[PDB]
């Protein structure tokens, strides 16, 4: 009920957050009883908004649905409501406005980029009463949400999956925008280079080993403190290699001690056989002596008789000894047959085992849009505990429906490439040009600038966008440290379905480690017959240089080897993405690079405050703000993350330029 | 707190595989070599043992004697007493051996002999003779 | 951010 509302908003139901503490210091420092009243009001308001996100939830309409005693304190309710509204926890996205927007605007904000982060912030700012204009370099909106549309064919070249609805803000958006969400069937069969499937046994054996190897790197990091090597941050790739090398070492160590047990025992045999051979000689010589003494025929003196009798006894004793040694000979002989029949494992992983493992590594390289040797060992999975619950889905009608819908009613200047960002104590001015005719210049004056340029663009050297004055070192250093990955897609449009329709995805196992991410995975998720191929890891960057024909050629080859040469027709339509080359992206999405950490995401999010114009003048207002996937530590590299960063900055900007009434 | 099951990762080993750029390859090689030098050592002793086994062909069957198989008699014949004296000279206190030599006397009867004929047969003197060897 | 296709 109210607890689900908190969960769906990424909030603890029974506790106040740091953000809430800042706006309600009176309540958090006060008695527990009052804190409980606040929590209920907050959760209930969230629930109301969540129950019907198609219409604006006003303060009036909120007080209405609340029962006593909660509905007694009208100010506390009003405060909580405004707080939620301002921070975009309620009334965000595309909803029917009950109170038509006041025609009179306050403040002027220029937003650089019209991707999801920029669009989300714009809606919020416009909704707050500010003058908002967005500048997009492309001839469209959505940025990294790029949908290919030709006829009935629909395929996403950028973001494609909604990663669980539980706690995901995209769930609200999906009720506001007609999104044909379809569950992803987890079943993923693999096909080796030769085109033959991988048996259930191996598939599971390698996958389990893969997870075991990752868990091992975690141990190696947290317990053995292997995080720095040669004054360099250890990468996930390095850690995996070391772990694998050590598993190969153990296999060899077990082998050695097994063959050493054999020799030790075989040396026990050597000694025993040496005894037996000498004893057999002793027995032979004694037998002769007895026979010679036995010759002397009765009757004989007592010494001659003693000789016979004594040698008889001595021989009996020695014959008993030999029998006991022969008893021991049979025990060791079979002990050796048992050991020789019990060899330990020959290899840690066979060539085929390694190739299948490389597919899992490629899969991980896809997830993080980067080769494993670039990922921070200590932090690559820092955002793990924030994953949403529920099954992963795809946008069957193309993800672009989201940005397009969010663009409705906004002032967006397309084909406008921002070139320079000037920010001072009295305001800002952004210099941009027409992408179609670069000489045509545009000047935009504003009170604040919200920068949503991708990390790739911010990294560009020489820079594509100049900041005046330059960004401070703390900001640029973060930019240099943070990783900006790459991953590409190959859209293959056909006229007929020649694949297993109940199978959403299937993999192709590359021959070598180097090419593991090369067209390693195929997606079958749309209405029309379309196959989407992934290019991850080191392959992504290299394949951008290869032409479409050659890429499609390789795709066809792979599919032929799997479905038969006379079953794969020549594609009617093909598209290949090149995110790194794309001047407005220069990569796909951020990753936690070795040497970086979740803290850099926070640094990326901090606004910039210019120095004073007049010396000795009071401390200016922050003027330059940042949003975007690379500015949200808990959900980076995602659509929801971008969306949330936009909502965050809108609240901070509004608080700064329109003032906060709910803090008092 | 611990590595995954079946997985092996010690501090000492990790440091070894990462001492230098080739350390890992050097470690694995030095083991591939140790394995080869032990396998050749196995076949060597296997062939040495095969020859020793061939020398024990037939075992000790042509050297085996039939058992004495006879009842124990309480009476001591002059012949038996004389055998004992010599048995004491050659075996000392191994009553079992002495009894086996005489044939028809038990272990206890031998012990009794030691006391019953201690003086007459200078057993004490005969015992010291055995100690000198 | 690990594997992705899970729950
Ligand atoms: C191939 C691929 C695959 C995936 C994903 C990305 C890609 C590329 N992601 C990540 C997701 O797409 C991404 O995080 C967001 O869409 C980006 O949001 P932003 O608003 O921060 O940047 P975004 O790059 O979208 O917006 C920045 C905008 O700035 C514009 N711009 C750049 N330079 C400019 C300039 N000089 N002047 C003016 N404008 C300029 C750009 O053109 C762009 O429109 C994803 N997400 C997810 O949730 N699940 C998924 O399935 C995936 N998988
Ligand atoms: Cl592109
Ligand atoms: Cl700071």
CATH number, domain containing residue A33: 1.10.10.10
Claim to verify: residue A271 and residue A368 sit in the same structural domain: no
What's the rounded Cα separation, in Å, for the pair A278 and A413?
104
Q: Is there a contact between A242 and B65 if contact means CB atoms under 8 Å apart? A: no
Q: Is there a contact between C4 and A383 if contact means CB atoms under 8 Å apart? A: no
Claim to verify: residue A578 and residue A653 sit in the same structural domain: yes
Of A54, A41, A117, A115, nearest to A81 (Cα)?
Answer: A41
With residue A217 as reference, give the H or E element that holds it.
helix A200-222
Chain A residues 276-305 with a CB less than 8 Å from chain B: 276-277, 280, 283-284, 286-287, 290, 302-303, 305
Nearest to C2 among A164, A184, A367 (CB): A367
Residue A355 belongs to domain spanning: 108-233+350-664
Return the half-sphere exposure (C-beta side, CA atoms, 13 A cut-off) of residue A391.
9
| Contact (CB, 8 A) for A276 and A322 | yes
Contact list, A637 vs chain C (CB under 8 Å): 1
Compute the nearest-CA separation of B54 from chain A (Å). Answer: 10
B12 touches A: beta carbon within 8 Å: no
Return the residue of B nearest to A289 by Cα: B63
Which domains occur in chain B, in start order? 1-133 (1.20.58.1880)
Q: In angstroms, what is the span from residue A422 Cα to ligand 3's centroid?
A: 20
Pocket of ligand 1 from Cβ distances under 6 Å: A 112-118, 135-138, 143-145, 158-161, 163, 417-418, 452-454, 457, 465, 487, 489, 579, 584-585, 588-589, 628-629, 637-640, 642
Claim to verify: residue A567 and residue A420 sit in the same structural domain: yes
Return the half-sphere exposure (C-beta side, CA atoms, 13 A cut-off) of residue A470.
6
Q: Is there a contact between C5 and A186 if contact means CB atoms under 8 Å apart? A: yes
What's the rounded Cα separation, in Å, for the pair B46 and A516?
46
Return the residue of C nearest to A188 by Cα: C5
Q: Which ligand is nearest to the CA of A158?
A: 1
Claim to verify: residue A289 and residue A361 sit in the same structural domain: no
Beta-carbon contacts of residue A640 (< 8 Å; ≥ 6 apart): A163, A168, A169, A170, A388
Of A587, A626, A170, nearest to A406 (Cα)?
Answer: A170
Claim to verify: residue A412 and residue A532 sit in the same structural domain: yes
Of A401, A402, A407, nearest to A111 (Cα)?
Answer: A407
Claim to verify: residue A394 and residue A308 sit in the same structural domain: no
A366 touches C: beta carbon within 8 Å: yes
Claim to verify: residue A167 and residue A32 sit in the same structural domain: no
End-to-end CA distance of chain B: 66
Domains held by chain A: number = 3
Of A559, A268, A311, A584, nearest to A454 (Cα)?
Answer: A584
Claim to verify: residue A241 and residue A223 sit in the same structural domain: no
| Contact (CB, 8 A) for A156 and A393 | no
B69 touches A: beta carbon within 8 Å: no
Claim to verify: residue A376 and residue A489 sit in the same structural domain: yes
Token pair for residue A482? 């943070």
Q: The domain spanning residue A345 has which CATH number? A: 1.10.287.80
Last residue of a domain, one of A61, A92, A107: A107
Contact list, A286 vs chain B (CB under 8 Å): 63
Claim to verify: residue A360 and residue A218 sit in the same structural domain: yes
Atom of ligand 1 nearest to the CA of A636: 14
Claim to verify: residue A151 and residue A27 sit in the same structural domain: no
- 3-state secondary structure (DSSP) of residue A556: helix
Atom of ligand 1 nearest to the CA of A587: 8
Last residue of a domain, one of A67, A92, A107: A107
Claim to verify: residue A560 and residue A656 sit in the same structural domain: yes
Beta-carbon contacts of residue A604 (< 8 Å; ≥ 6 apart): A455, A475, A478, A479, A482, A626, A628, A630, A631
Sheet containing A448-451: give its strands across: A411-413, A131-135, A108-112, A448-451, A624-626
Beta-carbon contacts of residue A572 (< 8 Å; ≥ 6 apart): A493, A494, A495
């Amino acid at each position: 009920g109210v607890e689900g509302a908190a969960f769906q908003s990424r909030l603890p139901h029974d506790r106040m957050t740091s953000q809430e503490a800042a706006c309600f210091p009176d309540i958090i420092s006060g008695p527990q009883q009052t804190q409980k009243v606040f929590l209920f009001i907050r959760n209930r308001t969230l629930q109301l908004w969540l129950d019907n996100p198609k219409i604006q939830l006003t303060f009036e309409a909120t007080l209405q649905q609340l029962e006593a005693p909660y509905n007694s304190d009208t100010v506390l309710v009003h405060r909580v409501h405004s707080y939620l509204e301002r921070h975009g926890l309620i009334n965000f996205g595309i909803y029917k406005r009950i109170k038509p927007l006041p025609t009179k605007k306050t403040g002027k904000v220029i937003i650089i980029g019209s991707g999801v982060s920029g669009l989300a912030a714009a809606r919020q700012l416009q909704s707050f009463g500010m003058d908002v204009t967005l500048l997009e370099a492309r001839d469209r909106v959505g940025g990294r949400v790029a949908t290919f549309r030709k006829g009935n064919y629909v395929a996403d070249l950028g973001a494609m999956v909604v990663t669980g609805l539980g706690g995901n803000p995209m769930a609200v958006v999906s009720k506001q925008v007609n999104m044909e969400l379809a569950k992803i069937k987890q079943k993923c069969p693999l096909y080796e280079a030769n085109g033959q499937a991988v048996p259930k046994e191996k598939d599971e054996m390698v996958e389990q080993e893969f997870n075991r190897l990752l868990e091992a790197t975690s141990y190696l990091s947290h317990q053995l403190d292997f995080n720095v090597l040669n004054n360099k941050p250890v990468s996930l790739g390095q850690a995996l290699e070391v772990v694998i090398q050590l598993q190969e070492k153990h296999v060899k160590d077990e082998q050695i001690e097994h063959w050493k047990k054999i020799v030790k025992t075989q040396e026990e045999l050597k000694e025993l056989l040496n005894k037996m051979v000498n004893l057999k000689e002793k027995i032979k010589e004694l037998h002769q002596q007895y026979k010679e003494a036995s010759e002397v025929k009765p009757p004989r003196d007592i010494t001659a008789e003693f000789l016979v009798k004594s040698k008889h006894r001595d021989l009996t004793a020695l014959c008993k000894e030999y029998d006991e040694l022969a008893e021991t000979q049979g025990k060791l002989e079979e002990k050796l047959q048992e050991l020789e029949a019990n060899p330990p494992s020959d290899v840690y992983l066979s060539s085929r085992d390694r190739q299948i493992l490389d597919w899992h590594f490629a899969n991980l390289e896809f997830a993080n849009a980067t080769p494993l040797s670039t990922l921070s060992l200590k932090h690559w999975d820092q955002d793990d505990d924030f994953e949403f619950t529920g099954s992963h889905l795809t946008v069957r009608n193309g993800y672009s429906c989201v940005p397009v819908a969010l663009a409705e009613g906004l002032d967006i200047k397309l084909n406008t490439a921002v070139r320079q960002v000037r920010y001072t104590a009295s305001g800002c001015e952004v210099i941009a040009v027409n992408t179609r005719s670069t000489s045509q210049t545009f000047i935009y004056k504003c009170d604040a600038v919200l920068c949503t340029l991708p990390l790739g663009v911010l990294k560009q050297q020489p820079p594509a966008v100049q900041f005046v004055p330059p960004l401070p070192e703390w900001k640029t250093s973060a930019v240099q440290r943070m990783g900006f990955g790459n991953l590409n897609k190959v859209v293959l449009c056909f006229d007929r379905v020649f694949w297993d329709p109940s199978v959403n995805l299937f993999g192709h196992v590359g021959s070598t480690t180097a090419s593991r991410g090369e067209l390693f995975l195929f997606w079958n998720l749309y209405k029309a017959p379309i196959l989407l191929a992934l290019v991850a890891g080191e392959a992504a960057g290299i394949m951008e240089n290869i032409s479409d024909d050659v890429i499609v050629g390789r795709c066809l080859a792979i599919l032929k080897g799997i479905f038969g040469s006379s079953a794969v027709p020549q594609p009617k339509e093909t598209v290949v993405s090149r995110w790194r080359a794309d001047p407005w992206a220069r990569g796909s999405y951020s990753y936690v690079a070795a040497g970086s950490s979740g803290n850099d995401y926070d640094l990326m999010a901090q606004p910039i405050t210019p120095g004073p114009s007049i010396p000795g003048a009071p401390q200016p207002i922050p003027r330059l703000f940042f949003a975007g996937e690379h500015t949200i530590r808990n959900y980076p590299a995602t659509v929801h993350g971008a969306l949330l960063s936009g909502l965050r900055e809108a609240g901070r900007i509004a608080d700064q330029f329109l003032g906060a009434m709910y803090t008092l | 707190r611990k590595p995954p099951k079946g997985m092996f990762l010690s501090q000492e080993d990790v440091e070894a595989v990462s001492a230098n750029a080739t350390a890992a390859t050097t470690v694995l090689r030095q083991l591939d070599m140790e394995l080869v030098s032990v396998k050749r050592q196995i076949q060597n002793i296997k062939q040495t043992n095969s020859a020793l086994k061939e020398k024990l062909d037939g075992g000790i069957e042509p050297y085996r004697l039939p058992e004495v198989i006879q009842k124990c008699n309480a009476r001591w014949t002059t012949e038996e007493q004389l055998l004992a004296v010599q048995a004491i000279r050659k075996y000392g206190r191994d009553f079992q051996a002495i009894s086996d030599v005489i044939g028809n006397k038990s272990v206890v009867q031998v012990k009794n002999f030691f006391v019953n004929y201690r003086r007459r047969f200078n057993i004490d003197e005969v015992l010291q003779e055995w100690e000198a060897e | 951010a690990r594997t992705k296709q899970t729950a």
